[PDB]
Design a protein around this ligand. Sequence first.
Ligand SMILES: Nc1ncnc2c1ncn2[C@@H]1O[C@H](COP(=O)(O)OP(=O)(O)OP(O)(O)=S)[C@@H](O)[C@H]1O
Ligand SMILES: [Mg+2]
Length: 758
Amino acid sequence: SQILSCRETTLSMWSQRHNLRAAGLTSADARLVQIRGMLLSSDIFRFHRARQETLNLSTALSDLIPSCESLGLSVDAAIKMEAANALWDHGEMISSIRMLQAIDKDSSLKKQSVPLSRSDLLSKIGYQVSVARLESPDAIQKKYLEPALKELKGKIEGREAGQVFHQFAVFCDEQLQNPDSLEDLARLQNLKKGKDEEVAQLKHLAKAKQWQELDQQELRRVEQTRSEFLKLCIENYLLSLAASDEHDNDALRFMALWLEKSEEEVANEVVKKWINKVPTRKFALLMNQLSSRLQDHNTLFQKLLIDLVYRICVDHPYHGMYHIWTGARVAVSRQRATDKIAKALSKNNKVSSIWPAIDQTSRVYHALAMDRDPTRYKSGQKVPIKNSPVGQNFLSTMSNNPIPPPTLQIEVSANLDYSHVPMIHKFAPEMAIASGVSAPKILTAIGTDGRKYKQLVKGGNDDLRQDAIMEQVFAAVSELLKLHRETRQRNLGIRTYKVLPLTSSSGLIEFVSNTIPLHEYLMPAHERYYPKDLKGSQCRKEIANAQTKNTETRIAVYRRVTERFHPVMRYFFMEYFPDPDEWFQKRTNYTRTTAAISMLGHVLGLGDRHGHNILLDHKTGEVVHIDLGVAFEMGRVLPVPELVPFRLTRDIVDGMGITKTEGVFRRCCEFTLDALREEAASIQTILDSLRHDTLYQWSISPVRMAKLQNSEADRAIEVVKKKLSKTLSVMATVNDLINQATSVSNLAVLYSGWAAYA
Ligand SMILES: Nc1ncnc2c1ncn2[C@@H]1O[C@H](COP(=O)(O)OP(=O)(O)OP(O)(O)=S)[C@@H](O)[C@H]1O
Ligand SMILES: [Mg+2]
């Protein structure tokens, strides 16, 4: 605000003082520059939601119009549009709409400086008239949207056309999923059904048949209207994706809309016509959903889907070829189709030194994962990977085939240039081993640029596709958080990692760089700082013995245990960051990331939040949540249910200081939850894309349910949708959540492996 106000003063004074200016700078030039600087400041003030400053600016701009018309400037349209924006942002919807319509009626948008295209004005009026319900959705399309598409004049590239096409596509989509129109279609369908049943009962007949035919004609009209809307929706989504990059979650919405209509040949003809102009970098992150619908059926849907998956794997190989490999090496048809795509991939010129590399490398990674020997691999040791035959074959094969580390997160390149990606140079000679049955081994790889990429080569009978899908969903929602001022100002978001499933029994997990598990810090620290307290194992055993007793005894035992167990988390920051400046910044990072993941894991039902799934990053302070596969409330179905919204035990809360909760954690919870329920449409779109994934399981299979404690899509998405309801205020919702997350009667009846005493 300070810089922008001083800039306003500067530009106005320079425009007034004619003798200070140079020779060839007339007063029209100074005036025009002043106006442009003011309009820029108005954009900036609008995002900050500073109402009074946009009001001041638009008033001071409207006062310049008389003195601008005498200098020979035509800046009335841009300034009146700024006034209309101020009105709309103060709540005057009808006044803003009337002002924009007056701009459109009597103004020459062609011959005037500070240009203003007629199609963006028309689409602005159309958007505002739709929001205010000021006209029927059949006149909005006839007066504002189709005239806008006609004003583009065949230009199908740029941000102007991107805005127009996204406007029109969202309008048509909104017309399809309309509760009134769906009720009307259902009513006409029941009428047709009942009248046909009555006619069958009879075979009076003449009039009955005539009424039946009139019903049929009405139903044909309604269905044809819906078919036109579907055509326009799909076509304009595809044209908006091909024009600009402003709207790129239109790829997720187009994909959901197209997978719902895989049989309606109308949709497939429109897609066939327009699909080849979208850059494949828009679909690159949707390969879990695309490669799950592959089949060999010779239809048109499959001939489009297979070609799209092929082009994605050719342009961005490190984003599609592992999906193809996993798919090759209704399940039989999917495997056959993925095998055909793989055979075609190992035939073309662009990707031919890349597909064999990934082939051989994945084979040896899987072989190394599956190889368990209790003698050759002792849990906790550190074995040089040259003594097993699998180890030597692995090292040789990896030396002969250079690839980027499979757990490195590669960003998608618009220029299609993946040469700047570090390849695996060599492997560290040894590999660690963790405790389990099928020994998870932690490899290290030294890359070309000289960094160390550690990896968990996880083998056994686990399902990493759940964890990978949920990591992708959480990353998408955290990306939604960046669009709002309050959460973006605080960098509220989650830390991601990379899961890569190789087969149905093995995967590569990214070993997060310099973290430490929460339980592995907390259990030694508890006895280092309080040598007279109970041990972690004594508390766990004491709580597990009273697991088959009444709630009164369980709560009494829990109080007795936590009276002899004091939190020590506040020391994690006093012993990794002794400098007060750094200590304060890192403790704030911890609090903010804990708040963001608490709200985000309440909204998505995230469970299984024990100490071994939470990592503490001792370089930046901020927590990382891994193992995100038990989501959508699957955790309160277990034998000993997890009935808390998130993990907020005494140690998580002790890491926050004098102000236990009231402070940074509560304000950040409220900003997160306030930004989440203003993106409920986008979260619905993400979960809808999840709904068309044939391989995602919406219930926890008794295998993992036994590994954890020693329509389902419709119910889950409905629960998510009612957690984002604006009925209660954010303050009251967060108060309730923090009351039930820290309650002793809730924490006392949790499973003993969920270390709640801690
Ligand atoms: N991707 C990862 N990055 C960094 N550390 C990890 C990662 N995955 C697991 N860890 C940690 O390294 C160890 C590996 O844990 P695992 O033995 O694979 O599974 P686990 O969670 O320990 O077993 P349970 O069922 O939870 S008792 C644990 O101490 C984890 O905290
Ligand atoms: Mg784990």
